[PDB]
Write a protein that binds this ligand. Structure first.
Ligand code: CLA
Ligand code: CLA
Ligand code: CLA
Ligand code: CLA
Ligand code: CLA
Ligand code: CLA
Ligand code: CLA
Ligand code: CLA
Ligand SMILES: CCCCCCCCCCCCCCCCCC(=O)OC[C@H](CO[C@@H]1O[C@H](CO)[C@H](O)[C@H](O)[C@H]1O)OC(=O)CCCCCCCCCCCCCCCCC
Ligand SMILES: CC1=C(/C=C/C(C)=C/C=C/C(C)=C\C=C\C=C(C)\C=C\C=C(C)\C=C\C2=C(C)CCCC2(C)C)C(C)(C)CCC1
Ligand code: SF4
Ligand code: SF4
Ligand code: SF4
Lengths: 80, 165, 143, 67, 35, 41, 107, 734
């Protein structure tokens, strides 16, 4: 499926997870940010690449990136 | 007599076009009584056409094989055949006016940035300030080249927003 | 959460007529998703696959063909009535997978029990150029 | 600890981050975190980006004086 | 050397009907070829 | 007055004023100098 | 049947006076296709004085409606229950907006 | 899942959708993105593909020769090259009706035939082919050559025959061999064939393989060549009253400098072209042994690249590091090759019509128009391909650490300045050209056309007066005998060239007026705008402010979503796909100008083009409406003339244009939802749900949608203009 990569510039604001319509991201404990939270993608096989997480990222550039490629039944959003 | 072309006064197709225009204006005029407003309107149109055809002649304008006047754009060639007033003088005048516009816009951009919310001044114009900068732009090239001399016209490449490579 | 709940097919479905955007042949060929919630009272909600339904006072079970529909229903129930539902995925052979509350605390929380995966530890824009990774099968963002 | 890990709060800074929207731009320091995070320098910018935000976190090595 | 007069009556239907039909048949079997 | 003046100080209103001013200037120039093409004093 | 309907006249400025064609009747203008001439002939309008009076009445009613909008928003704003009386709105529109206007035009 | 059709992509194999087919075709020959691909395997696949394309080209020209020989009138056209039209191929369509069969019988044929417009008849008459048996043996020999090339590609693909990586990367030896052998001795053999065959065949002497090694091309017999008296070859040139098919007014000359055109056939002399190709061959051979091979002499590419750096930091590091950049990145070489070849075919198009090299080619108006239009469209297409593959080079294989401070790093550093200046010049040209055209149209509309602005193109007229055209007057070079340019070559090529350039019948330096000036500025606007789009796509290919990480997303990706205000059409592929539209508009402009000017020249009403190209009403009415009367009357309820097929393919092109509008305007969400509804309809129906699809039907990708819309748009454009051009030039001429 698609590739979801999260960098260290994330501030743990949990906006990307709330904007996710397929429950791909998660919040794990961290020490590199003030909020002590870091975004993770343990369910990247269910991500369709809608880039809704990138819209909700408040940091400049993007702390979360979605790269398309190798579309599957789950990645193409097919009910059939 | 440049570019194998004849002057408009010496040309025959120019006079033929003028005669055809006068003929169709007279044909339109003959359908109205002399004591009617369309008659005076068509007479004024014919007078304007005759004045324009007289002014296009005896002014250096030349036409080739169709009676439609041609314009010479190369400086020097237009200078030695009295064709500078065709495009050479108007292009300098347009450059003067365009520099006026650019200098006035630059002055308004710079002078409305050292204040709180410059976008508010951009969207709601300071009309007395705009008119003052409008009437102060008559010496735009002097101020432009002086800003070039002191270096305030151009910004250095360190304070300029730049795209990643 | 502490113990992963097991789905019950005998739980009553919410009061609804017939759906046209319901489960297709993929439900009997590939996996299909099933959402469960616990309604304290009967009320009308809007399904993502059609019109409106009425949930029963008790357990409620619904079936969908896409996980996005399940999460849309979940977030609608959480925003409108604070229901906290949960959906499973059932394959063709009957394998049941727990999907939304992986630690039972929802992904908005942390719970100090999830290991962060697929996290690049370098800043964005510090990735190598595609010329550096050529004829290797490794993307610049996958390292 | 000693002095401060970052610049003075409220002072103008120039962002040296190339991938940022505010590269070679002047911003105002809001607060500098002292716990030891990667990007403690919070900078507020007068002009918003395409996303509409105007604040970002930068590290110590990507801020300089306004020239 | 010179082709016979019935060559337009044979090659044109061959490359207009038969050859594209067998090409689409081969391509359809190649698209849906599974392991 | 000053609220109405700031409304008149908005960009569309001053743009409209410039539009009427420039259009009227060019139209009166064309009317009192009928159809010129070459600058001949 | 011989004079084309014309109601727009241009100003002779840059040679656009040629758009004032010979529509007939000793007039120069643009041949209009709105059919306003036939509408005014169907309404019994004969002289230009009636058209002037209709124009002045239209301007007066336009100013009255513009003041009415200002009044019914800023001064006397109807409530939500006033707008929700759909039965009264339908009755007044069927009887007064359409039927009374139809009877007045018939008369 | 995991079907075997995309064997070059394991990820595409595991795609249960119809898109797997489509992405299995568009990514077919992108070997750099294939799984488990090495550089040596990529080079071997490239070599096999090149041999395949060569075999296809040779098979195609063999088929052209065979279909001209069989079901053609080559001998009848040889006898009378003025009246009877060439025949391309016979028509066997059972859907044809009897009036359609009767109407298509032209050129003295026994069946329905197509009038040839490719111009191979004139070319094969010029090179010396006269009989149908010669065309037959040439076609079968080219078919054998194509089969040999296909077998060679297969054998070089086979193991223990694949070339090494250093064999492909040996740039110096390849450059020397292709400069000296592919261009030098090829041109030498071609001009030897010219001297041996074409000049005797143009002088009424048959030279064949049977009588080869027996007839001497020059009566002196090669002894002036060894004696150094090369001027003896240019002793008795062909006279003005010389017949091309016969020996009347012939001569004994194989290499000369008779600049101009043959008066009988309005084409360049065969001896002049033979001398040209001989000089070209000598220049290529003497420059084909300059680079450093395994011998001790030669030139190293990297040494000259690194040494050519301006002092005092004019270009920073200079041209250093470009050798590895060219050698490692194949897309850079692809872009350079496509740009050079596009400039070459642009020059070919601009030099065929003014200087026809083939006998009886200028009289064939439809042939010249079709050839010019085809060459210009191909030129624009590979111009755009050069720029697109340059953007591909910038995205895929470009290491700034390698070429740091060089010319590439510098032009990537100030790319904003280049893009801004190109945008400014595009805005300037477009604003002033549209303002001038609208001003002229308004002035002509008001009944007083003398008020329009007609800026005389004095620069081109001054150039043409400096090159021999005395129509404009003036006293520059090649018009006054006191000039050194007139004195030099006064008895070499000037008397013929001046006669050719002072004639108004041919297309050699035609009269240029204010309408020509305006359309030339429109052409300049089109070229500068397409250049702006393509260099903005190439320079911002690997990154921008909206997408700094554009290199990680590849060359052809749809968007980044609706975030940051919207990011659709941000890849360099989208910039190329917009530049395809702009290139199509520009080539449409140049072809409209060429077609209208040449049509008014052939009709003799050059004044109509002079007084009608100024304003766009003249372009719409006197060109797109007046000349389309015969095209639209190809088929009607009254009957049918010979231009029925051209009207049908004109409407066909307008239809494909509309389908391009379909695939370009509407985007993916509506069609995806509609496909979902159709999937439900097929799933929930009796007597039809027994069947099923092996792959799930999905809507086409956004990049795929752009490609399909571009293809339909370009196909409709090409077919429409080809139909209009051929129907207008052939319906009233011959
Ligand atoms: C007699 C004095 C003299 C002069 C006139 C020059 C001049 C030049 N030398 Mg040089 N040279 C000199 C002495 C001189 N040199 C000496 C003493 C040495 C030591 C032996 C050299 C060694 C040397 C080397 C080794 C090389 C040069 C090169 C060059 C050229 C490029 C210089 C440069 O940096 O680009 C000029 C500076 C720039 C910053 C470039 C800006 C270019 C702009 C951006 C392009 C604008 C294009 C624009 C769109 C055009 C619009 C027109 C429109 C119609 C399209 C330039 C023509 C180079 C060369 O051959 O190039 C031709 C080169 O490789 N020189
Ligand atoms: C024939 C139709 C047409 C026209 C006129 C334009 C015009 C333009 N496009 Mg193009 N374009 C078109 C179709 C067209 N496009 C199509 C179908 C495509 C494929 C999708 C593109 C793809 C494309 C690209 C990829 C690019 C352009 C660019 C441009 C600009 C070129 C600069 C120029 O020539 O000076 C301007 C000339 C003009 C004719 C513009 C029209 C201005 C006139 C004078 C009207 C101005 C207003 C006027 C005073 C009236 C005011 C009142 C009114 C508003 C109510 C210009 C805005 C380039 C650009 O943005 O420039 C940097 C660019 O990069 N276009
Ligand atoms: C780059 C654009 C350009 C071009 C193509 C021309 C072309 C021409 N100019 Mg011009 N010129 C130009 C810009 C240009 N000019 C500019 C910017 C100036 C300074 C204002 C001049 C000043 C100039 C003079 C003073 C003369 C020419 C003359 C000429 C003609 C012959 C030039 C020559 O070397 O012999 C030719 C028509 C000469 C002419 O008219 O022919 C004898 C002449 O006397 N030109
Ligand atoms: C007065 C302000 C101002 C100034 C000084 C400039 C200056 C420049 N622009 Mg910019 N531009 C402006 C406004 C301005 N622009 C606006 C409002 C727009 C949006 C329509 C643009 C759109 C624009 C484009 C798309 C491009 C430029 C380019 C350029 C450069 C070429 C010069 C030129 O004439 O381009 C031509 C500029 C125009 C045609 C824009 C004219 C817009 C209106 C007509 C002028 C507005 C005047 C303003 C109301 C004055 C305010 C005074 C105040 C007291 C109220 C130059 C750096 C070009 C570039 O990059 O060159 C390197 C280029 O490609 N500009
Ligand atoms: C029989 C009485 C009557 C009449 C004739 C009208 C007439 C009209 N109503 Mg109204 N309405 C009425 C009763 C009436 N209403 C009642 C009782 C209610 C409350 C239930 C409403 C609620 C209502 C709403 C919510 C809306 C209307 C609107 C409209 C206009 C519809 C647009 C149209 O057809 O243009 C026809 C235009 C003309 C014939 C031009 C002349 C219009 C004159 C000035 C109106 C004279 C009639 C007036 C009602 C007399 C009383 C007002 C008096 C105090 C001065 C029209 C003017 C719409 C509107 O706002 O339009 C402005 C609208 O959205 N009506
Ligand atoms: C809305 C449409 C309309 C209007 C305005 C009229 C109006 C008129 N028609 Mg017509 N008519 C109509 C429809 C209409 N009709 C229809 C549909 C038909 C069916 C075919 C006819 C058939 C018809 C015929 C056959 C005839 C008329 C006639 C008349 C006139 C007689 C009026 C009369 O006695 O009525 C009754 C009028 C009143 C009771 C007056 C109203 C009460 C007043 C206004 C009270 C004022 C009080 C006030 C406070 C005090 C003054 C204030 C001051 C001090 C400031 C009148 C001009 C007749 C005519 O022209 O001869 C004269 C005639 O022969 N009409
Ligand atoms: C010397 C010539 C040459 C060579 C060797 C290449 C080679 C390559 N290019 Mg390049 N290219 C060229 C010319 C060339 N191109 C030209 C002239 C253009 C401009 C049109 C382009 C534009 C271009 C783009 C924009 C892209 C490439 C890409 C590619 C790669 C994919 C090829 C492949 O295996 O897929 C095989 C591909 C296909 C089979 C698709 C062809 C479909 C065509 C358009 C259909 C024909 C149109 C029409 C329907 C025909 C019927 C007409 C009708 C009337 C009957 C490959 C490296 C791609 C790449 O590198 O991937 C990132 C890429 O993105 N090229
Ligand atoms: C003098 C010797 C010689 C000659 C005549 C050729 C001739 C050719 N080689 Mg070259 N080549 C040579 C030596 C030579 N090679 C050497 C020594 C090497 C190794 C360093 C190569 C490596 C090489 C590669 C890697 C490729 C060629 C290709 C080609 C063909 C280019 C297409 C063409 O004809 O353009 C026609 C040009 C005009 C009509 C003008 C052509 C048949 C290409 C090919 O396979 O065919 C397309 C190709 O990809 N050659
Ligand atoms: C009370 C009184 O006499 O008010 C007379 C009114 C208002 O009179 C004054 O107005 C002031 C604002 O201009 C303030 O509101 C004052 O309080 C008010 O007394 O004067 C008018 O001219 C009436 C309004 C005329 C225009 C109506 C346009 C409505 C919109 C239609 C579109
Ligand atoms: C004489 C003449 C001519 C010619 C011309 C020429 C040849 C020119 C050139 C030119 C050039 C070669 C130029 C260059 C430039 C460069 C640069 C670099 C620039 C810059 C600029 C600027 C910077 C500006 C600015 C401004 C603005 C925009 C605004 C404000 C003001 C000012 C002015 C400051 C012709 C025939 C056409 C026409 C007639 C006349
Ligand atoms: S939206 Fe961005 S900054 Fe916020 S938690 Fe997600 S990756 Fe981090
Ligand atoms: S692209 Fe969409 S589905 Fe994928 S991680 Fe982002 S928000 Fe979630
Ligand atoms: S290409 Fe489509 S999905 Fe992408 S940003 Fe544009 S409209 Fe949105």
């Amino acid at each position: 499926a698609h590739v979801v990569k999260i960098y260290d510039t994330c501030i743990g604001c949990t906006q990307c997870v709330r904007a996710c319509p397929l429950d791909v991201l998660e919040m794990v404990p961290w020490d590199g940010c003030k909020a002590a939270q870091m975004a993770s993608s343990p369910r990247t096989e269910d991500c369709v690449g809608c880039k809704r997480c990138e819209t909700a990222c408040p940091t400049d550039f993007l702390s979360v990136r979605v790269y398309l490629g190798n579309e599957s039944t789950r990645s193409l959003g097919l009910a059939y | 007599d440049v570019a194998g072309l004849t002057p408009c006064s010496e040309s025959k197709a120019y006079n033929k076009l003028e005669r055809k225009e006068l003929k169709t204006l007279e044909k339109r005029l003959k359908k109205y009584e002399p004591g009617s407003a369309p008659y005076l309107a068509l007479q004024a149109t014919k007078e304007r056409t005759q004045n324009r055809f007289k002014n296009y002649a005896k002014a250096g304008l030349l036409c080739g094989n169709d009676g439609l006047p041609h314009l010479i754009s190369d400086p020097g060639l237009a200078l030695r055949f009295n064709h500078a007033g065709e495009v050479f003088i108007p292009t300098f005048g347009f450059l003067y006016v365009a520099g006026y516009i650019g200098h006035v816009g630059r002055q308004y951009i710079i002078k409305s940035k050292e204040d709180a919310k410059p976008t508010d001044k951009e969207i709601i114009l300071d009309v007395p300030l705009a008119l003052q900068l409008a009437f102060q732009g008559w010496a735009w090239p002097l101020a432009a080249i002086q800003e070039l001399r002191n270096g305030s016209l151009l910004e250095k490449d360190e304070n300029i927003t730049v795209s990643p490579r | 959460p502490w113990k992963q709940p097991e789905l019950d097919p005998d739980t009553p479905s919410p009061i609804f007529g017939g759906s046209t955007g319901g489960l297709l042949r993929k439900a009997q060929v590939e996996e299909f998703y099933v959402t469960t919630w616990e309604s304290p009272k009967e009320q009308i909600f809007e399904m993502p696959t059609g019109g409106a339904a009425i949930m029963r006072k008790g357990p409620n079970l619904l079936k969908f063909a896409r996980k996005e529909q399940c999460l849309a229903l979940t977030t609608q129930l959480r925003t409108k009535f604070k229901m906290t539902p949960c959906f499973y995925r059932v394959y063709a052979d009957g394998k049941v997978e727990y999907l939304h509350p992986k630690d039972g605390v929802y992904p908005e929380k942390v719970n100090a029990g999830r290991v962060g995966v697929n996290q690049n530890m370098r800043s964005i824009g510090e990735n190598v150029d595609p010329i550096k990774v050529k004829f290797t099968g490794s993307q610049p963002f996958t390292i | 600890k000693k002095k401060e890990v970052g610049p003075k709060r409220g002072s103008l800074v120039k962002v040296l981050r190339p991938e940022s929207y505010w590269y070679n731009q002047v911003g105002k320091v809001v607060s500098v975190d002292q716990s030891g995070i990667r990007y403690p320098v919070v900078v507020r910018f007068e002009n918003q980006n395409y996303a509409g935000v105007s604040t970002n976190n930068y590290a110590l090595d990507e801020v300089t004086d306004p020239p | 050397f010179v082709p016979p007069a019935w060559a337009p009556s044979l090659f044109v239907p061959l490359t207009g009907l038969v050859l594209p039909a067998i090409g689409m048949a081969w391509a359809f079997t190649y698209i849906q070829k599974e392991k | 007055m000053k609220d109405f003046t700031t409304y008149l100080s908005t960009a569309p209103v001053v743009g409209l004023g410039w539009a009427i001013f420039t259009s009227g200037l060019l139209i009166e120039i064309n009317r009192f100098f009928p159809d010129p093409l070459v600058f001949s004093f | 049947t011989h004079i084309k309907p014309s109601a727009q006249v241009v100003w002779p400025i840059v040679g656009q006076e040629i758009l004032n064609g010979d529509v007939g009747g000793g007039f120069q203008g643009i041949q209009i296709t709105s059919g306003f001439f036939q509408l005014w002939r169907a309404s019994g309008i004969t002289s230009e004085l009636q058209l002037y009076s209709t124009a002045i009445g239209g301007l007066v009613l336009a100013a009255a409606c513009f003041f009415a909008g200002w009044f019914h928003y800023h001064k006397a704003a109807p409530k939500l229950e006033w707008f929700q009386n759909v039965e009264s709105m339908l009755n007044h529109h069927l009887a007064g907006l359409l039927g009374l206007g139809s009877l007045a035009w018939a008369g | 899942a995991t079907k075997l059709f995309p064997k070059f992509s394991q990820g595409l194999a595991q795609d249960p959708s119809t898109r797997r087919i489509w992405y299995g075709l568009a990514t077919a020959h992108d070997f750099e993105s294939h799984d488990g691909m090495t550089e040596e395997n990529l080079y071997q696949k490239i070599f096999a593909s090149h041999f395949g394309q060569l075999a296809i080209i040779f098979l195609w020209t063999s088929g052209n020769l065979f279909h001209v020989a069989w079901q053609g009138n080559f001998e009848q056209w040889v006898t009378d090259p003025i009246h009877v039209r060439p025949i391309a191929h016979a028509i066997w369509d059972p859907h044809f009706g009897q009036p359609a069969v009767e109407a298509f019988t032209r050129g003295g044929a026994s069946g329905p035939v197509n009038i040839a417009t490719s111009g191979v008849y004139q070319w094969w008459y010029t090179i010396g082919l006269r009989s149908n048996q010669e065309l037959y043996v040439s076609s079968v020999f080219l078919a054998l050559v194509s089969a040999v090339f296909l077998f060679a590609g297969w054998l070089h693909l086979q193991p223990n025959f694949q070339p090494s990586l250093s064999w492909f990367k040996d740039a110096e030896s390849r450059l020397n061999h292709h400069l000296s052998g592919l261009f030098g001795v090829s041109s030498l053999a071609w001009t030897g064939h010219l001297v041996h065959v074409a000049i005797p065949e143009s002088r009424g002497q048959h030279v064949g393989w049977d009588n080869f090694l027996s007839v001497l091309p020059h009566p002196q017999g090669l002894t002036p060549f060894w004696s150094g008296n090369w001027a003896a070859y240019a002793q008795n040139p062909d006279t003005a009253s010389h017949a091309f098919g016969t020996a009347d007014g012939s001569g004994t000359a194989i290499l000369t400098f008779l600049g101009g055109f043959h008066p009988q056939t309005q084409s360049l002399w065969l001896s002049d072209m033979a001398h040209h190709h001989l000089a070209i061959a000598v220049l290529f051979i003497v420059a084909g042994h300059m680079y450093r091979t395994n011998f001790g002499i030669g030139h190293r590419l990297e040494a000259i690249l690194e040494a050519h750096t301006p002092p005092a930091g004019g270009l920073g590091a200079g041209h250093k590091g470009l050798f590895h950049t060219v050698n490692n990145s194949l897309h850079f070489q692809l872009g350079l090759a496509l740009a050079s070849v596009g400039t070459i075919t642009s020059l070919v198009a601009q030099h065929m019509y003014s200087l026809p090299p083939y006998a009886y080619l200028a009289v064939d108006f439809t042939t010249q128009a079709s050839l010019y239009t085809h060459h210009q469209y191909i030129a624009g297409f590979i111009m755009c391909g050069a720029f697109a593959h340059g953007a591909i080079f910038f995205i895929r294989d470009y290491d700034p650490e390698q070429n740091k401070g060089n010319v590439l790093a510098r032009v990537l550093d100030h790319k904003e300045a280049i893009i801004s200046h190109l945008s400014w010049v595009s805005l300037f040209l477009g604003f002033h050209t549209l303002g001038l055209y609208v001003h002229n149209d308004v002035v002509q509309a008001f009944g007083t056309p003398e008020k329009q602005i007609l800026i005389e193109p004095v620069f081109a007229q001054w150039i043409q007066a400096a090159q021999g055209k005395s129509l404009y007057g003036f006293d520059l070079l090649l018009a006054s005998s006191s000039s050194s340019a007139y004195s030099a070559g006064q008895s070499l090529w000037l008397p013929g060239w001046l006669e050719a350039i002072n004639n108004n019948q041919n297309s050699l330096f035609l009269t240029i007026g204010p309408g020509d000036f305006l359309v030339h500025h429109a052409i300049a606007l089109g070229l500068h705008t397409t250049t702006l789009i393509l260099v903005k796509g190439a320079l911002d290919a690997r990154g921008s402010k909206l997408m700094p990480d554009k290199k990680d997303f590849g060359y052809s990706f749809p968007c980044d979503g609706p975030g940051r205000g919207g990011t659709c059409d941000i890849s360099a592929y989208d910039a190329f796909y917009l530049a395809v539209f702009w290139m199509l508009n520009t080539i449409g402009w140049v072809t409209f100008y060429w077609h209208w000017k040449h049509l008014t020249l052939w009709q003799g009403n050059v004044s109509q083009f002079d007084e009608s190209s100024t304003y766009l009403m003249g372009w719409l009415r006197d060109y797109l409406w007046l000349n389309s009367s015969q095209l639209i009357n190809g088929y009607n309820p009254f009957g049918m003339n010979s231009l029925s097929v051209w009207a049908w393919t004109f409407l066909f092109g307008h239809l494909v244009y509309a389908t391009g509008f379909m695939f370009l305007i509407s985007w993916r969400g509506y069609w995806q939802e509609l496909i979902e509804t159709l999937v439900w309809a097929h799933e929930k129906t009796p007597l039809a749900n027994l069947v099923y699809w092996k792959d799930k039907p999905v809507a086409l990708s956004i990049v795929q949608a752009r490609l399909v819309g571009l293809a339909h748009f370009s196909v409709g454009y090409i077919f429409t203009y080809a139909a209009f051009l051929i129907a207008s030039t052939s319906g009233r001429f011959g």
